[PDB]
Design a protein around this ligand. Structure first.
Ligand SMILES: NCCOB(c1ccccc1)c1ccccc1
Ligand SMILES: NCCOB(c1ccccc1)c1ccccc1
Lengths: 491, 166, 95
């Protein structure tokens, strides 16, 4: 336990700081055998390092997405698991929580490893070593196959699960590809189909609240009607405070989520801001200030824009929303940077001129900026000002501005967005699936006040017989698949 | 179209003021229907198929997002500009029409010096034009470019199927 | 004629509910031959199922667009048609 081995930034190599781990990670299937079967002092296979990692954990960490590294790690992992089972069957090495409190599957999920993670997710062995199997196969009557994947430490019922770890703890660049694999896809689809009613009830309730807000804000101050207005006001205040409480409780519960990916969701912040604006607007109206209308109308606008969060719950619209976000974040801010530089330069240039003659256009910076933005919006006033003594200079400056902005920048932005849309096609589907999975996980947990009862999906299907007496049970997720490539090889 | 024509004639027999709307709608629908016959050529049937595919693929999502944004901003602007220091944004129809003018190429983006919330109104209009005139329309251009690129051979196959049905 | 074999939504496998159809759709070119030419009781090749399907119909339904499934169905279809023609030419099974 020094400095070179400890996993850090710089010159480093981590192998679990153990001779057996060094041998295994080094692709040395011989000295590992001798160490395991040396009679004088056999090496225990469940001994840990300083960080709490074990040999399997060490194999997991050094795993990468390179095909050769993935193959090496897969082979070594399987062989070592088989050997450990053959030595001391009484102990399950797959369930060994390190200091952070994770198993090799959970660690592989958190660290971003995909190949080893998927291999651990769905693996099967022969009659011998059968218990060391995640995927099973009840029967293959005809071309159909009924697979039964284990759901231990991967279902959402547990305090910590693989779904939760991927959604809220993984910070890999493309963790959205880890929720499209086999029953992390089908399981999530089943949960989504079961929970549609809750999502659409929430959408309807939010729409009703926003409609009441709009109605109150339209027929607002400038008997029966007064009572209706007052009850609308109190309902809006109650809704705003309830949204604020919900969002604050969400942030308190998931307070270790923002630093991972602020822009992954970026919608809870908007809801919190809208609730804050609504409540603060009501308070300042109680104060009888002239800034009540701005804040109230801003809250209204923000809510009507937020409704996109709910409208992205469909296959055909969630992808569009994802593409909108991707384009906004990819290529719209560089265009704004260049545009504002050009616009400020030309606006101040025009203001400096047209201040010496032979209703004064370009009186200040605001007027010139507005005129330039009118040029950009389709109503540019490009005339021959005959009053000012620099007619030609002003005309040429305007022509240069329109040529540099109206031809280059906007049409180039069109082209760049075309390229961006072409680039992100499948990633859009993966990110939509990840967003829907996150929404499903959030819904599964109850509201900030109602403690929703957990529903532990999966069938308690007895699988095989362990190397013991009385048999074993394991929850699994049935999945039927019609296959002929596999079926034609079982003959 | 046939129902509209016959019903328009019947209501004209009734001497009602709704004869002209139905009659003109029938005329428009027929002149649009003529595309059914014009798509009987190799060079034009594919274009008609592409039109239909684009309409069904990516033009209704754009409308959904557009109408959400437009209604929100229209009601927001109507709520404001109702307190001073010809009243623009008098109702919802006027504000919606003004926003659609922004989108059509004749946006009236001025500095209303009469109402007491000059800056708020100006910033709301700027935000609307930035969110709609830059993102949505040009993004729609890009999405239709992608859609046209995607459906090239399927267009020919669908044209052949349509001609076979005819 | 039960529930699993019926072509419906859920867990199902349709094979025409006939032993010869089950053998043919199962890529079993041997028991099909024995059933065809067993002297004790040869199996008629134009016997239908409840829905009215025949062996050729059953081969058609289970067909998919997978290259391997397409090849399997094509080979079985051609071989069975040739055999049926060789046994009872007087009847056209294609109709
Ligand atoms: N702020 C309203 C919602 O966010 B959107 C947006 C607008 C303001 C600030 C940043 C982004 C937007 C992005 C994707 C879908 C719809 C619109
Ligand atoms: N309704 C007139 C014809 O249909 B088109 C159309 C217009 C109104 C409603 C829906 C579609 C149209 C689509 C393809 C070719 C030409 C135009």
């Amino acid at each position: 336990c020094g400095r070179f081995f400890q996993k850090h930034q710089g010159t480093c190599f981590y192998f679990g700081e153990l001779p057996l781990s060094l041998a295994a990670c080094t692709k040395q299937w011989d000295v590992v055998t001798y160490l395991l079967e040396n009679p004088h002092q056999p090496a225990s296979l469940e001994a840990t390092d300083s960080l709490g990692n074990t040999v399997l954990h060490a194999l997991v960490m050094i795993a990468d997405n390179s095909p050769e590294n993935s193959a090496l790690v897969i082979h070594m992992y399987d062989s070592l698991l088989q050997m450990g089972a053959r030595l001391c069957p009484t102990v399950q090495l797959e369930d060994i929580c390190n200091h952070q409190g994770l198993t090799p599957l959970k660690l592989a999920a958190k660290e971003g490893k995909i190949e080893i993670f998927r291999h651990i997710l769905q693996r099967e062995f022969s009659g011998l070593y059968q218990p060391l199997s995640r995927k099973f196969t009840e029967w293959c009557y005809g071309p159909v196959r009924v697979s039964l994947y284990d759901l231990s430490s991967v279902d959402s019922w547990e305090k910590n699960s693989v779904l939760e770890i991927i959604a809220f703890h993984c910070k890999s660049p493309h963790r959205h590809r880890m929720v499209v694999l086999e029953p992390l896809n089908k399981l999530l689809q089943e949960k989504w189909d079961r929970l549609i009613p809750r999502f659409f009830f929430n959408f309807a309730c939010y729409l009703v609240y926003m409609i009441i807000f709009t109605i109150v804000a339209y027929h607002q101050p400038s008997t029966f009607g007064d009572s209706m207005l007052l009850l609308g006001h109190i309902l809006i205040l109650l809704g705003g405070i309830y949204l604020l409480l919900g969002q604050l409780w969400y942030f308190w519960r998931r307070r270790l989520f923002i630093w991972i990916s602020f822009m992954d969701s970026y919608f809870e912040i908007l809801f919190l801001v809208q609730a804050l604006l609504t409540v603060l607007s009501q308070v300042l109206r109680f104060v009888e200030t002239e800034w009540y209308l701005p804040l109230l109308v801003s809250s209204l606008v923000l809510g009507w824009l937020n409704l996109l969060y709910y409208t992205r719950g469909f296959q055909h619209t969630g992808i569009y929303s994802v593409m909108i976000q991707k384009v906004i974040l990819r290529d719209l801010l560089r265009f704004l940077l260049v545009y504002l530089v050009f616009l400020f330069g030309f606006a101040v240039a025009l203001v400096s001129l047209s201040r010496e003659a032979r209703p004064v256009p370009y009186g200040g910076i605001l007027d010139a900026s507005l005129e330039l933005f009118k040029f950009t919006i389709g109503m540019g006033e490009l005339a021959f000002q005959e009053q000012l003594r620099f007619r030609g200079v002003v005309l040429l400056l305007l022509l240069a501005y329109v040529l540099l902005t109206y031809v280059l920048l906007l049409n180039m932005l069109i082209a760049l967005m075309s390229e961006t849309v072409n680039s992100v096609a499948t990633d859009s589907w993966s990110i939509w699936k990840l967003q829907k999975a996150i929404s499903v996980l959030e819904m599964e947990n109850g509201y900030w006040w109602c403690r929703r009862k957990r529903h532990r999906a999966g069938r308690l299907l007895k699988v095989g017989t362990k190397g013991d007496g009385i048999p074993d049970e394991r929850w699994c997720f049935r999945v039927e698949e019609v296959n002929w490539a596999a079926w034609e090889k079982t003959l």
